Ligand binder design. Structure first.
Ligand SMILES: *Cc1cc2c(cc1C)nc1c(=O)[nH]c(=O)nc-1n2C[C@H](O)[C@H](O)[C@H](O)COP(=O)(O)OP(=O)(O)OC[C@H]1O[C@@H](n2cnc3c(N)ncnc32)[C@H](O)[C@@H]1O
Ligand code: HEM
Ligand SMILES: CCCCCCCCO[C@@H]1O[C@H](CO)[C@@H](O)[C@H](O)[C@H]1O
Ligand SMILES: CCCCCCCCO[C@@H]1O[C@H](CO)[C@@H](O)[C@H](O)[C@H]1O
Ligand SMILES: CC1=C(C(=O)Nc2ccccc2)SCCO1
Ligand SMILES: O=C(O)/C=C(\O)C(=O)O
Ligand code: SF4
Ligand code: F3S
Ligand code: FES
Ligand SMILES: [K+]
Ligand code: NA
Lengths: 240, 101, 139, 612
C-alpha cells in the first residue's frame, strides 16, 4: 500500500523574476518518508524537484534554520509532524510579510541587524579583569535566565506579530526584545538602565499591543509576550 | 528622557480612571462626574486613536497630517461634551433619559 | 565592518528596489480567539470614540435640547422588543471594550501570560460581555 | 568571463563561523588584524549550536582537580595516536579558556558557591587514571553548544570583523606552495569573490554526512578538508571516525552522554546493565569507542530491543524528575518529539551513530597546516586550521566527550595568537595570477549545467550506504576492499552527474553537488586508509587484525625488545592524497609526537594497555 499526501508549496525564482509567485503541489508517499515536514521537503528535493529551495541544517529543531509557515502557523519544519490526514493538503509558505530571496527562503538581514542593535553581550563597568576568574552567579540568579537563553533566533515569533508586519522597520519585535530582557536581568551585566533607556521611543518596544501571537507560535515553548510585559514594568519604574 | 514610558504610564492611569468613573456615574451623577467623564473620555480616546495612527500611518507628511486632524477632532469633541454638560442635562442624566425610552 | 544602523539602511535600499515579492501574511495566517479579540478591542475602541465625537458634534449643531429628541422617540411607541434590541447593540461594544480593557490592565501588571490563561481570560471576557449586556438592555 | 569576479584584500580570512571560526575571527580582529569571516551559514546555525554535554576544564569546582590528569585522560583516550605537545597545550589552557567564555556571559549552570557546574563524562578520571571519576565537564544544562555559539556570536559583534554570510568557499588560492586566500561563491547574488590575505584559517567542521546515519548537520560536508585535498596537500587519520554511543533510534539525533554523566544507564532487552560486563570499572562512562563496540556486540548477539531488535535502551527514569528538568531538559523535549518518550517513565531507544571525525587537516600544535616531505614535517606558509576540520592531533584514534568544544576555542585562539606573533597587520597582501581560481569557476560551471544520467541525490545516497555498510563500527579487510571498489566506481560516475536548477541565485541543487564532490574526496581517503591500517586502534577496529601494533610490545617488559622499524608497525599517522581527476588515493605515514611542551612540568605518557 501507499499513503499519498499532498503539499502545496510557495514558489518564486529570482532568476525568472517575471514569473509571479505561485503554489506547486507535490504528492509524497508517507510510508517512504520521515515523520516531519522537513523530511517531506528533503524527499521532494531529492526525488521530485531539485529546484525546490529552503534553508535547513540540524534536524532536531536547535539551529533555527528551517522556520516557515505550515498550515497557517510559523514553526520549524524539522519538528513539525506531517498531518497524516490524506484528504487535507498542507500549505507551506515563507515566514510571513518578509522579502523572499527564493521559494521558502526569506531575507532575515533586518532581523539580524535589529538583534545587533541591542548589544547582546555581557557588559561590565570594568572589563579589564576579563579572563582571570569565574564571575560568581547564584543558582537563584541563574534561574532567572531560564526561558530566555534558550531562544534559537528562528524569527517565528516576530514574523507572526501584526505590529512587526506593519512596523518591522522600527519595532524591534518579540525575539529581539526578549533577548534585550535576557541581558537586562543577567546579574552579571551592569548596563540595565542603558538597555532600558535604549527603548525610550514610540516604536522599539511600544508597538507591542499584547496580541500574543509570538508566545502561541514559539516552537521552543518560550514566552516573549511575558518578557515584553516585564520590560514595560521595568520601563515604568526604573529611576533616572 | 523617559517620555515614552511616562506616556505609557499615563495611558494606563487614564484607562483606570475611566473604569472608576463608570460606577461613579451610577452612584453619584451630576456635574463632577459629568465633566470628569468629558475629560477622561476625550483624553483616553485621543491617545487611543493616536496609537492607531502610529501603527498604520507611515510617511513623514501623512503622519503629521493625521495627528493634526486628531487634535482637531479631540478639541471639538471635548468642547461639545462640556457644552452639553453646561447648557443641557449632562452626560449622566442624558444616559438615564435615553434608557427610559 | 558595518554597524546595525548601516545594515538596516542597506536592507531597505536593497529590497525596496528589488524584484523580491513580499510573502503573504493576513491572507494565510491561522486565526485564533486571542488574535480576533485583539482586533475587536481596537474595533470597539474606535467605534466608541467616533460615537462620542458624533454625539459631541450633534450637541453643538442640532437645534433642540436633548429631552426634545427623547420625547419624540417615546411618542412613536416603538415595540419594546425593538427598543431592547437597540439597547443591546448600544451597550455591547462598550461592555466588550470595558471587560477586555480590564484584561489588558491585568496583562500590564504582568499577570495572566500563560497561553492557557490567555485563552481562558478571553472566554471569560466574552461571557461577562454577554451577561452584562443582556442584563443592562433589560433595564 | 561568464561570472563577475569581486576581489577583496584582507590581512586574514577565516573560512568557518562555528566555535573555532568565530573564536579565530574575532581573535584576529582583537589583535588588530583586518579580518574576513566567510561562512556558508548564518553563524548561529553551525553544528556547534547543536552541542549538548559541555566542555572540559580542570577548574576544580566540584572536587580538587589537575589539568595534568585531564592531559593523561586525553592521551590514553587517543590510544597513543595523539600528539602530546598539542594535548599538553589544550588541557593546560582549558581552565583559562572556559573562564574566558563565562566572562563573555555564557550562562553556565551554577553550584551552590556560584561557580560553574561540572558533570562527569565518559573516560575522565582523577589521579592519572587511579582515583575514580572526574567531574570536569562544564555545561549549560544539556545545551552547552547552543550557549557557547550564541555567546561567541554576540561577542564577535563587538569587533570590526567583516562577515561574508552565505558564501560558499570553493578552493584555496595557492602559489609556490603557499596559501594566499580563498575563492568563493556568494549564494545570495551569484557572484564569484576572491579573498586575498597573508593568512588563511580553515575552520569548516567535519564530514559526518558521508554516512547514511549520523548526528551531524546536513551542512557537515567536509568542504575545507576537500579544499586542502584539491590543493595537493595531505589529510590525516581520516579512517578514525567516532561513533557516538547514543543517537536516538530512527532520527539519529544525539542524546547527550551527559545522561550517563548524571546517572543514566544503558540496558539491553533482558534489562541487563551490560556495561558492567564490558567495562567493570567505568561501566557506561567508558570511552566512546568501547561503549559503541559493546552496544554493537549486544545487538549482534541478539539482545537488542524494539520490534527489530536493532537498538538498546538508555534509562533515566530512576533519576529524580527535578534533576532531569534541571540537568537534561533539552533531551527531555527531544526524546518526546522524536521517539514519543517521557523520560521520567520510559527509556530512550538509542544506538551508536556516526558523530565526529578525529582526522582532518594535519597541523602542528600552533595551528599551522603541515605537510610531510622526505621524512620531515614542513609548515605550509600562510595556512592554518582549527576545530573539527583539523588534526592537531589532540584526539588521536578516539576523542573524549567534551574535548571538542574545548579544542574549538583553544586552537581558534592559538591560530590567532600564532599569526599575531608571526605577522603584523597591514603587511602587503600576497599577489595572485590574474586567472587564479579559474578552475574552481569552471568546475562550478560544469555542475551548474550538468545533464547526465545520475542525479546528485542518487550518487550521494550510494556513497552514504556504501560507507554505512563497509566502514562501520567493526571492519574487515574484504568488506573494506569491496567498499573501496564501490566508492571508486561512484567517484568515476560523477562524470555522469545530472542537475536541474540552472539558476545561480540560491541554487541549492548546485551547492549540494559541490558538497557531494567534497564528501566523496573525504570518503575515499577514509575507506582507503582504513583498508591499509591492518591493526585495531581506538575507534578503528579490524576483526582480522585485532591487536594494536606499536613500535614495541607494551604489554611486556621493554628490556631486551627489538624496536620494530617504522614500516613494520602502525603507531603512526596516516597521510592521504587524492589525484582529483582520477580518484587515485595515495597513502604515506608520519610519526606521532610523544614529547610534551615541557617534560619537567608534564611528563610524556608512554603507550600502555588501554582498558576502561
Ligand atoms: C554533532 C554534534 C557534535 C557535538 C555535540 C553534539 C552534536 C549533535 N556535542 C558536543 C559537546 O557537548 N561537547 C563537545 O566537546 N563536542 C560536541 N560535539 C562535537 C563538536 O560539537 C563539533 O566537533 C564542533 O562543534 C565543530 O565545531 P567547528 O567550529 O569545527 O565547526 P562547525 O560548528 O561544524 O561549523 C563549521 C563552519 O564552517 C562553515 N563552512 C563549511 N563549509 C563551508 C564552505 N564550503 N564555505 C564556507 N564556510 C563553510 C560552516 O558555515 C560553519 O559555520
Ligand atoms: C469609552 C471608551 C472609548 C471611547 C475608548 C476608546 C479606546 C480606543 C480608541 C482605544 C485604542 C484602540 C487600540 O489601540 O487598539 C482604546 C484602548 C484601550 N482601552 Fe478604551 N475606550 C473606552 C473605555 C475604556 C474602559 C472603560 C477601559 C477599562 C478601557 C481600556 C482600554 C485599554 C486598556 C486600552 C489599551 C488596549 C491596548 O493596549 O491594545 N477603555 N480605547
Ligand atoms: C486632546 C489633547 C490631548 C493631549 C495631547 O496628547 C499628545 O497628543 C499627541 C498628538 O497625537 C501625541 O503624539 C502625544 O503622544 C500626546 O502626548
Ligand atoms: C471569528 C474568529 C474566531 C477565531 C477562530 C478560532 O480558531 C481556533 O481557536 C482556538 C482558540 O484560540 C485555537 O486553539 C485553535 O488552534 C484555532 O483553530
Ligand atoms: C497592530 C494591532 C492590531 C492589528 O493590526 N491586528 C491585526 C490586523 C490585521 C490582521 C491581523 C491582526 S489589533 C490590536 C492592536 O494592534
Ligand atoms: O561529542 C561530545 O564531546 C559530547 C557529546 O556528543 C554529548 O553531549 O554527548
Ligand atoms: S522566542 Fe521562540 S519563536 Fe522567537 S526566535 Fe526565539 S525560539 Fe524562535
Ligand atoms: S504578537 Fe506582537 S504585539 Fe506584543 S505580545 Fe507578541 S510582540
Ligand atoms: S533544520 Fe535546524 S531548526 Fe529545523
Ligand atoms: K578533527
Ligand atoms: Na543586570
Amino acid at each position: 500500500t501507499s499513503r499519498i499526501k499532498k503539499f502545496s508549496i510557495y514558489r518564486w525564482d529570482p532568476d525568472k523574476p517575471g514569473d509571479k509567485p505561485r503554489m506547486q503541489t507535490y504528492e509524497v508517499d508517507l510510508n517512504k518518508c520521515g515523520p516531519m515536514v522537513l523530511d517531506a521537503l528533503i524527499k521532494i528535493k531529492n526525488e521530485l524537484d531539485s529546484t525546490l529551495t529552503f534553508r535547513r541544517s540540524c534536524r532536531e529543531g536547535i539551529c533555527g534554520s528551517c522556520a516557515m509557515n505550515i498550515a497557517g502557523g510559523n514553526t520549524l519544519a524539522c519538528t513539525k509532524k506531517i498531518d497524516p490526514d490524506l484528504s487535507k493538503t498542507t500549505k507551506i509558505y515563507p515566514l510571513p510579510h518578509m522579502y523572499v530571496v527564493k521559494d521558502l527562503v526569506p531575507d532575515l538581514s533586518n532581523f539580524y541587524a535589529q538583534y545587533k542593535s541591542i548589544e547582546p553581550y555581557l557588559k561590565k563597568k570594568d572589563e579589564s579583569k576579563q579572563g582571570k576568574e569565574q564571575y560568581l552567579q547564584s543558582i537563584e540568579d541563574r534561574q532567572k535566565l531560564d526561558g530566555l537563553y534558550e531562544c534559537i533566533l528562528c524569527a517565528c515569533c516576530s514574523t507572526s506579530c501584526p505590529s512587526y508586519w506593519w512596523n518591522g522597520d522600527k519595532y524591534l519585535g518579540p525575539a529581539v526584545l526578549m533577548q534585550a530582557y535576557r541581558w537586562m536581568i543577567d546579574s552579571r551585566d551592569d548596563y540595565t538602565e542603558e538597555r532600558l533607556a535604549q527603548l525610550q521611543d514610540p516604536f522599539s518596544l511600544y508597538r507591542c499591543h499584547t496580541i500574543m501571537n509570538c508566545t502561541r507560535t514559539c516552537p521552543k515553548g518560550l514566552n516573549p509576550g511575558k518578557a515584553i510585559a516585564e520590560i514595560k514594568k521595568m520601563m515604568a519604574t526604573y529611576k533616572e | 528622557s523617559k517620555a515614552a514610558s511616562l506616556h505609557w504610564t499615563s495611558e494606563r492611569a487614564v484607562s483606570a480612571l475611566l473604569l472608576g468613573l463608570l460606577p461613579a456615574a451610577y452612584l453619584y451623577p451630576g456635574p463632577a462626574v459629568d465633566y470628569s467623564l468629558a475629560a477622561a473620555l476625550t483624553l483616553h480616546g485621543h491617545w487611543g486613536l493616536g496609537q492607531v495612527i502610529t501603527d498604520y500611518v507611515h510617511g513623514d507628511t501623512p503622519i503629521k497630517v493625521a495627528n493634526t486632524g486628531l487634535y482637531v477632532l479631540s478639541a471639538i469633541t471635548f468642547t461639545g461634551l462640556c457644552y452639553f454638560n453646561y447648557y443641557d442635562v449632562g452626560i449622566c442624566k442624558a444616559v438615564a433619559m435615553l434608557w427610559s425610552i | 565592518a558595518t554597524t546595525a544602523k548601516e545594515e538596516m539602511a542597506r536592507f531597505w535600499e536593497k529590497n525596496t528596489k528589488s524584484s523580491r515579492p513580499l510573502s503573504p501574511h493576513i491572507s494565510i495566517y491561522k486565526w485564533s480567539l486571542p488574535m480576533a479579540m485583539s482586533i475587536t478591542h481596537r474595533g470597539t475602541g474606535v467605534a466608541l470614540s467616533l460615537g462620542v465625537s458624533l454625539f459631541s458634534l450633534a450637541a453643538l449643531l442640532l437645534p433642540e435640547q436633548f429631552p426634545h429628541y427623547v420625547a419624540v422617540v417615546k411618542s412613536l411607541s416603538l415595540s419594546p422588543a425593538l427598543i431592547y434590541s437597540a439597547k443591546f447593540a448600544l451597550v455591547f461594544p462598550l461592555s466588550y471594550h470595558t471587560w477586555n480593557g480590564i484584561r489588558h490592565l491585568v496583562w500590564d501588571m504582568g499577570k495572566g501570560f500563560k497561553l492557557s490563561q490567555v485563552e481562558q481570560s478571553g472566554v471569560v471576557v466574552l461571557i461577562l460581555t454577554l451577561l452584562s449586556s443582556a442584563a443592562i438592555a433589560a433595564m | 568571463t561568464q561570472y563577475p569576479v569581486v576581489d577583496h584584500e584582507f590581512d586574514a580570512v577565516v573560512v568557518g563561523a562555528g566555535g573555532a571560526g568565530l573564536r579565530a575571527a574575532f581573535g584576529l580582529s582583537e589583535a588588530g588584524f583586518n579580518t574576513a569571516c566567510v561562512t556558508k551559514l548564518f553563524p548561529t546555525r553551525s553544528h556547534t549550536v547543536a552541542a549538548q554535554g559541555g566542555i572540559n576544564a580542570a577548574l576544580g569546582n566540584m572536587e580538587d582537580d589537575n589539568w595534568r590528569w585531564h592531559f593523561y585522560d586525553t592521551v590514553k583516550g587517543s590510544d597513543w595516536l595523539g600528539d602530546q605537545d598539542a594535548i599538553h597545550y589544550m588541557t593546560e589552557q582549558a581552565p583559562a579558556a572556559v573562564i574566558e567564555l563565562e566572562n563573555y556571559g555564557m550562562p553556565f549552570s551554577r553550584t551552590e558557591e556560584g561557580k560553574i557546574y561540572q558533570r562527569a563524562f565518559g573516560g575522565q578520571s582523577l589521579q592519572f587514571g587511579k582515583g575514580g571519576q572526574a567531574h570536569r565537564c562544564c555545561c549549560v544544562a544539556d545545551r552547552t553548544g547552543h550557549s557557547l555559539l550564541h555567546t561567541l556570536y554576540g561577542r564577535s559583534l563587538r569587533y570590526d570583523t567583516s562577515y561574508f554570510v552565505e558564501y560558499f568557499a570553493l578552493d584555496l588560492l595557492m602559489e609556490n606552495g603557499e596559501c594566499r586566500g580563498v575563492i568563493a561563491l556568494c549564494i545570495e547574488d551569484g557572484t564569484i569573490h576572491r579573498f586575498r590575505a597573508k593568512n588563511t584559517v580553515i575552520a569548516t567542521g567535519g564530514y559526518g554526512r558521508t554516512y547514511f546515519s549520523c548526528t551531524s548537520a546536513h551542512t557537515s560536508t567536509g568542504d575545507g578538508t576537500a579544499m586542502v585535498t584539491r590543493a595537493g596537500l595531505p589529510c590525516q587519520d581520516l579512517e578514525f571516525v567516532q561513533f557516538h554511543p547514543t543517537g536516538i533510534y530512527g532520527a539519529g539525533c544525539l542524546i547527550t552522554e551527559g545522561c550517563r554523566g548524571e546517572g543514566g544507564i544503558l540496558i539491553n532487552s533482558q534489562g541487563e546493565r551490560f556495561m558492567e560486563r564490558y567495562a567493570p570499572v567505568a561501566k557506561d562512562l567508558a570511552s566512546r569507542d568501547v561503549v559503541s563496540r559493546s552496544m554493537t556486540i549486544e545487538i549482534r548477539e541478539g539482545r537488542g530491543c524494539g520490534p527489530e531488535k536493532d537498538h538498546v535502551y538508555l534509562q533515566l527514569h530512576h533519576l529524580p524528575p527535578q534533576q532531569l528538568a534541571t540537568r537534561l531538559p533539552g533531551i527531555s523535549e527531544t526524546a518526546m518529539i522524536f521517539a514519543g518518550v517521557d523520560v521520567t517513565k520510559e527509556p530512550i531507544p538509542v544506538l551508536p551513530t556516526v558523530h565526529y571525525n578525529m582526522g582532518g587537516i594535519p597541523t602542528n600544535y600552533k595551528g599551522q597546516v603541515i605537510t610531510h616531505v622526505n621524512g620531515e614535517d614542513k609548515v605550509v606558509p600562510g595556512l592554518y586550521a582549527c576545530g573539527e576540520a583539523a588534526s592537531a592531533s589532540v584526539h588521536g584514534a578516539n576523542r573524549l566527550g567534551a574535548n571538542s568544544l574545548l579544542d574549538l576555542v583553544v586552537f581558534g585562539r592559538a591560530c590567532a595568537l600564532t599569526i599575531a606573533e608571526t605577522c603584523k597587520p597591514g603587511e602587503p597582501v600576497p599577489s595572485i595570477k590574474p586567472n587564479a581560481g579559474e578552475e574552481s569557476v569552471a568546475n562550478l560551471d560544469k555542475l551548474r549545467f550538468a545533464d547526465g544520467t545520475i542525479r546528485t541525490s542518487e550518487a550521494r545516497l550510494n556513497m552514504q550506504k556504501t560507507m554505512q555498510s563497509h566502514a562501520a563500527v567493526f571492519r574487515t579487510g574484504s568488506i573494506l576492499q569491496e567498499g573501496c571498489e564501490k566508492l571508486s566506481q561512484i567517484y568515476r560516475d560523477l562524470a555522469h552527474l545530472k542537475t536541474f536548477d540552472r539558476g545561480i541565485v540560491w541554487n541549492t541543487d548546485l551547492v549540494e553537488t559541490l558538497e557531494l564532490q567534497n564528501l566523496m574526496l573525504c570518503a575515499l581517503q577514509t575507506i582507503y586508509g582504513a583498508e591499509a591500517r591492518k591493526e585495531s586502534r581506538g575507534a578503528h577496529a579490524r576483526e582480522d587484525y585485532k591487536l594494536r601494533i606499536d613500535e614495541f610490545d607494551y604489554s611486556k617488559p621493554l628490556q631486551g625488545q627489538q624496536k620494530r622499524p617504522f614500516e613494520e608497525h602502525w603507531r603512526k599517522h596516516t597521510l592521504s592524497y587524492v589525484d582529483v581527476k582520477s580518484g587515485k588515493v595515495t597513502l604515506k605515514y608520519r610519526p606521532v609526537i610523544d614529547r610534551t611542551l615541557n617534560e619537567e612540568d608534564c611528563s610524556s605518557v608512554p603507550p600502555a594497555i588501554r582498558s576502561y
